[PDB]
Design a protein around this nucleic acid. Structure first.
Ligand SMILES: [K+]
Ligand SMILES: [K+]
Ligand SMILES: [K+]
Ligand SMILES: [K+]
Ligand SMILES: [K+]
Ligand SMILES: [K+]
Ligand SMILES: [K+]
Ligand SMILES: [K+]
Ligand SMILES: [K+]
Ligand SMILES: [K+]
Ligand SMILES: [Mg+2]
Ligand SMILES: [Mg+2]
Ligand SMILES: [Mg+2]
Ligand SMILES: [Mg+2]
Ligand SMILES: [Mg+2]
Ligand SMILES: [Mg+2]
Ligand SMILES: [Mg+2]
Ligand SMILES: [Mg+2]
Ligand SMILES: [Mg+2]
Ligand SMILES: [Mg+2]
Ligand SMILES: [Mg+2]
Ligand SMILES: [Mg+2]
Ligand SMILES: [Mg+2]
Ligand SMILES: [Mg+2]
Ligand SMILES: [Mg+2]
Ligand SMILES: [Mg+2]
Ligand SMILES: [Mg+2]
Ligand SMILES: [Mg+2]
Ligand SMILES: [Mg+2]
Ligand SMILES: [Mg+2]
Ligand SMILES: [Mg+2]
Ligand SMILES: [Mg+2]
Lengths: 153, 84, 206, 127, 98, 115, 100
RNA sequence: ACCUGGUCUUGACAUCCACGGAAGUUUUCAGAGAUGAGAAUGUGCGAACCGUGAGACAGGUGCUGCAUGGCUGUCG
RNA sequence: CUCAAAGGAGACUGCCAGUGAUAAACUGGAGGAAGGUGGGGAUGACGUCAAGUCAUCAUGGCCCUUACGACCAGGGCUACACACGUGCUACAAUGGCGCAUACAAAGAGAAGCGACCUCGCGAGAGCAAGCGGACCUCAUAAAGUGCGUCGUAGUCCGGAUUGGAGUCUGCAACUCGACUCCAUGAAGUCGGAAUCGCUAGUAAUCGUGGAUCAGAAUGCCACGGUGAAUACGUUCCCGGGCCUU
């Protein structure tokens, strides 16, 4: 906004684990305000992921995030003449928001049976730098690489 | 359609017109405006001329017209296609 | 743009209703139609009696009409003769026993309905519209109004192109809800068509 | 003796009765796990107790009306908090630090003329 | 026991009648229960203000009907006849039940 | 897996598989399995020949397939030669149950035909 | 509304009362489950003989002050236009501009 | 409020006057109906309410929102 | 006690600190249900578009008067090569179907709302209480949750169309009603250029009611349930405000 009068909203931690980080991921996955339906999907995928690895539900989730979080992105910048895609540092919070959004978007595009299984296969490949989401993080880093010359606009 | 517990509808002025002509040999066309009248199993034969809004069109009542209303045989709108 | 009706917006705040009975849905519509016919008759019969406001009540199977006026002797007549002539027509119309009360409008120069009717009668007599509005505004300001506004619209002076003109003195704060704002309108039927008059009169915040 | 708290949230209002006990909870003559099947609702109800560490020192008798699952759960959480403060008054500082004392005043915004809902406008077209 | 139900479009007018119904009753022997403020009814109306088109330009009106309940338990004989002759103000609906 | 002259699927529940017959919807398919004494959730693959035949007679109680396809074709035929308004709508491919034709009506008209 | 159109509703209101009881018992026969099959037939034929304007379904609520056949409101017996004019003049008891 | 056909002319809706008649109820035929022709029963309490006859008139959702009032949109 | 509705209390940048021109104010803290216009509504300045409405009504002028007035029946306003606007339902598994099982708010009703009971597969029917209502009726909220099943298919997705058979309102459902049952099972597998709404109890999604009304909502007006994402910033697009040229 013009006036910059936008503070922050508190988010409740998830029931099973008490992680606000995970509770946002349920929110990104939720549609039509059906939160319980999204809570179940996340919990099921998290257990399939917990037994597909040796780590707890959280530590396997963080390892998935660490491979999808972008560090630098490009934003347009119209100045006296034309517009350059300037590479900008992604702030720590937006790193998590982008990582979660790409995971949920990639999993929705798969072709497995349930959404709980699709989310599980994406969270697993994200631990091995495979599949989409991880690739989306690669395409963003490439664009920000080819525009490093414009890192002062 | 009309509830069965009420029986088919017939305009009373038409019911007299078919009575006064089934017993006689009146083959003159019957001119009516009563498109709402159910066709009964008693005037299979003569020609009722039903109104379509601007004239009376003769329909030759046969057997298979029983249960239909008279108006089902007198179309009201004139259509021939666009640019046809 | 368009403004809210100054009377209606204050009806529960500082202004009272002009009809004060109670009814269920079964007779609400029939009470409204009989109040309409009563006021329709009283207004036509008492056209020269400076009738400002006709308040109608309905205590119980009876109607009580209160006629606010500045010429009550004209309303009443000799020894209450005329006021009796209406007490019969009203009962005929309402269909219940009728009772008429005569309230006193003192200072008619401070009543919006009377001021609007004064200007309107002058316009039907081919008085200069400018002179009528100024007189009305000066009178009310002299009698102690905190403000007044008068507006006249139509083919003023028989002009072909209609227009609106208005004067104002003092304060007329239409956005203040607790402001005592007497507002009323009137219509003149000249040889060139209808001319509409609106009058606001401010009497102080409550 | 008995301690009381009135809680409200959305269109819900909860009557809460607190007395020393061992940690049993009744809501409309049902158990907590019977009444609230949603897992979030159960956590919301408990939240004040896990904070002050009086989980199994009390007995909860609770009646609620109106609203829905999340409203009633949140309404109980408010009235519970008001009960504990009638119990001990030194808890207000730590409860208010958790945002439990505040009555959440967010209600459904009314539908308005010309709008499809409270704010959704009909689709616009220049021509 | 007799039931007193009071209707009016104005809650100030309805409190005058109740204040004088529960005053001309405790004097004349019988005792009173109440008055009871029953839930107010709010009837709403929405109309189009323009004589032609402009569908989104509307006025929203409302009539509020206030309700009162008065219980005269153990009515003495001087109490009853002291009720129909009170003659309450206009615009106050009064229903007597036995 | 051969009833009413057609072949019905073998990997589907009996209640779903019977709906492949022209003239048997979900309701009739539910009645037949009830009249034969067979569950609904049983695949017709594991149905003994001693049970398929007990379905064939029940299907014979209903006018299905070609006999129904001829009845429906005859009903329409009767309206079209009659000259009734409904038969004129069948002649001209327009909707018959009084729907709007200024717009829509594309199921009876088909895809759009430019001028 | 036109004067003729207003007079059409006063006629339809009169005829709906003059034949009110005579219409109700005929439909009592027709709706009667255990009547016969020929008096039902006669009652059906007899109902068509009464003038059409005697059925209450032929009436159209009109603004009692203008005759407008649209925008009617039953609680006041007026069109939406006249309801607004009377409401702002304070001529409808208890009616004020609503806001919640 | 439109079309086709069937119908009326102080008139479906007001006022005035003349004359006829309580008003109403109950049925028959012709006609799609409007309506026309009847046929019964009441005649109570001038003035109600009907019919007819005249001419002042009524009637118009006919035109002009670029003659207007009132009301509304709009920039906001 | 929840609640009903009358009367009161409460928020004022009042308090504290810093900042600031010893100002206005701002930034933050305390207390508090609420903090800086608390949230939402009502409220629309002088004027602008000869903007809309002579068909709500009123009205100057003009025009018609055995007709442009009045009465009636039938038809039409529901037409259909086509083009656009606003909506509804979908294309499914965050789903469909079956069974079980929770939790609302707001409102209407006397030529009305109509329980129970019995009959009907059902829409409904017969009988018949109660209610001018915090009492009776409409009237089971649905999404949700538990268990089963379907297993990615134009399908147990979708429900258009059409045949047959009915119900109800009404003098009367042919043109041209709504709803029920059986059968039929269309397009459609996420939509080109382009374009719209929304900053929080909002969007999205889920049901409920009301006005009009004999009957006839996917429209309108209103009510609760669940309940997000994001806002670094003001260069750009659109509209606007102030000073200057
Ligand atoms: K104008
Ligand atoms: K004119
Ligand atoms: K028609
Ligand atoms: K059509
Ligand atoms: K729609
Ligand atoms: K299917
Ligand atoms: K129809
Ligand atoms: K689309
Ligand atoms: K209806
Ligand atoms: K400039
Ligand atoms: Mg909502
Ligand atoms: Mg009520
Ligand atoms: Mg079916
Ligand atoms: Mg239709
Ligand atoms: Mg007129
Ligand atoms: Mg109607
Ligand atoms: Mg003609
Ligand atoms: Mg104009
Ligand atoms: Mg603070
Ligand atoms: Mg406004
Ligand atoms: Mg213009
Ligand atoms: Mg125009
Ligand atoms: Mg016009
Ligand atoms: Mg007609
Ligand atoms: Mg139309
Ligand atoms: Mg299906
Ligand atoms: Mg209703
Ligand atoms: Mg296809
Ligand atoms: Mg598919
Ligand atoms: Mg905003
Ligand atoms: Mg909805
Ligand atoms: Mg400024």
């Amino acid at each position: 906004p013009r006036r910059r009068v936008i503070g922050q909203r508190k988010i409740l931690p998830d029931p099973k684990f008490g992680s606000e980080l995970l509770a946002k991921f349920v929110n990104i996955l939720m549609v039509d305000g059906k939160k319980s339906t999204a809570e179940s999907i996340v919990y099921s995928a998290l257990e399939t992921l917990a037994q597909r690895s040796g780590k707890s539900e959280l530590e396997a989730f963080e390892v998935a995030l660490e491979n999808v979080r972008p560090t630098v992105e490009v934003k347009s910048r119209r100045v006296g003449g034309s517009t350059y895609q300037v590479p900008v540092e992604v702030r720590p919070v937006r790193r998590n928001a982008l990582a979660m959004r790409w995971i949920v978007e990639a999993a929705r595009k798969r072709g497995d049976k349930s959404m709980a299984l699709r989310l599980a296969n994406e969270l697993s490949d994200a631990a091995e730098n495979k599949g989409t989401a991880v690739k989306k993080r690669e395409d963003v880093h490439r664009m920000a690489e080819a525009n490093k010359a414009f890192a002062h606009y | 359609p009309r509830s069965l517990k009420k029986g088919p509808f017939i305009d009373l002025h038409l019911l007299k017109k078919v009575e006064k002509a089934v017993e006689s040999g009146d083959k003159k066309p019957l001119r009516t405006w009563s498109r709402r009248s159910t066709i009964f199993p008693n005037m299979i034969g003569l020609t009722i001329a039903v109104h379509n809004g601007r004239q009376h069109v003769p329909v030759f009542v046969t057997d298979e017209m029983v249960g239909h209303k008279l108006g089902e045989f007198a179309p009201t709108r004139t259509y021939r296609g666009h640019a046809a | 743009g368009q403004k809210v009706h100054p009377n209606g917006i204050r009806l529960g705040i500082v202004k009272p209703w002009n009809s004060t009975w109670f009814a269920n849905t079964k007779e609400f519509a029939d009470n409204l139609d009989s109040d309409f016919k009563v006021r329709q008759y009283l207004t036509k019969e008492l056209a020269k009696a400076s009738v400002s406001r006709i308040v109608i009540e309905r205590p119980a199977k009876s109607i009580r009409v209160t006629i606010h006026t500045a010429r009550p002797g004209i309303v009443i007549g000799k020894k209450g003769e005329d006021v009796e002539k209406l007490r019969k027509v009203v009962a005929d119309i309402a269909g219940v026993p009728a009772q008429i009360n005569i309230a006193e409008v003192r200072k008619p120069e401070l009543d919006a309905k009377l001021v609007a009717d004064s200007i309107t009668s002058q316009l039907e007599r081919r008085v200069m519209f400018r002179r009528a509005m100024k007189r009305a505004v000066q009178n009310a300001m002299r009698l102690g109004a905190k403000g007044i506004k008068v507006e006249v619209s139509g083919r003023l002076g028989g002009a072909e192109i209609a227009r609106t003109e208005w004067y104002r003195e003092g304060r007329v704060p239409l956005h203040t809800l607790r402001a005592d704002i007497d507002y009323n309108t009137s219509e003149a039927h000249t040889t060139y068509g209808v001319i509409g008059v609106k009058v606001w009169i401010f009497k102080g915040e409550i | 003796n008995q301690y009381y708290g009135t809680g409200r949230r959305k269109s819900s209002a909860a009557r809460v009765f607190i007395k020393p006990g061992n940690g049993k909870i009744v809501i409309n003559q049902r158990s907590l796990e019977q009444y609230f099947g949603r897992e979030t609702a159960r956590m919301v109800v408990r939240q004040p107790l896990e904070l002050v560490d009086m989980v199994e020192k009390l007995d909860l008798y609770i009646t609620v009306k109106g609203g829905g699952i999340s409203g009633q759960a949140g309404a109980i959480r408010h009235g519970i908090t008001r009960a504990l403060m009638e119990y001990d008054e030194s808890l207000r500082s730590e409860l208010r630090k958790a945002g439990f004392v505040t009555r959440d005043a967010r209600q459904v915004e009314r539908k308005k003329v010309g709008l499809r809902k409270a704010r959704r406008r009909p689709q616009f077209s220049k021509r | 026991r007799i039931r007193i139900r009071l209707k009016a479009f104005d809650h100030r007018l309805i409190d005058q009648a109740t204040a004088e119904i529960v005053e001309t009753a405790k004097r004349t022997g019988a005792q009173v229960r109440g008055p009871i403020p029953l839930p107010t009814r709010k009837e709403r109306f929405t109309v189009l203000i323009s004589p032609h088109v402009n569908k989104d330009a509307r006025d929203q009106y409302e009539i509020r009907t206030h309700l009162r309940l008065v219980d005269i338990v153990e009515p003495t004989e001087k109490t009853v006849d002291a009720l129909m002759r009170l003659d309450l103000a206009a615009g106050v609906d009064v229903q007597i039940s036995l | 897996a051969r009833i009413a002259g057609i072949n019905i699927p073998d990997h589907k529940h009996a209640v779903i598989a019977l709906t492949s017959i022209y003239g048997v919807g979900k309701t009739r398919s539910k009645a037949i399995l009830a009249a034969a004494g067979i569950a609904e959730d049983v695949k017709i693959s594991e149905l003994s020949e001693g049970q398929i035949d007990t379905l064939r007679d029940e299907v014979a109680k209903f006018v299905v397939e070609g006999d129904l396809r001829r009845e429906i074709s005859m009903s329409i035929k009767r309206l079209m030669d009659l000259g009734c308004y409904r038969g004129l709508r069948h002649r001209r491919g327009l909707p018959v149950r009084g729907q709007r034709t200024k717009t829509n009506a594309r199921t009876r008209k088909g895809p759009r035909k430019p001028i | 509304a036109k004067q003729s159109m207003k007079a059409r509703e006063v006629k339809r209101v009169a005829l709906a009362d003059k034949y009110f009881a005579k219409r109700a018992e005929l439909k009592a026969i027709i709706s009667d489950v255990n009547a016969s099959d020929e008096d039902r037939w006669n009652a059906v034929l007899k109902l068509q003989t009464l003038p059409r304007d005697s059925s209450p379904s032929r009436q159209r609520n009109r603004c009692r002050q203008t005759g407008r056949p649209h925008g009617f409101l039953r609680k006041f017996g007026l069109s939406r236009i006249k309801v607004r004019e009377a409401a702002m003049r304070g001529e409808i008891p208890g009616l004020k501009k609503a806001s919640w």
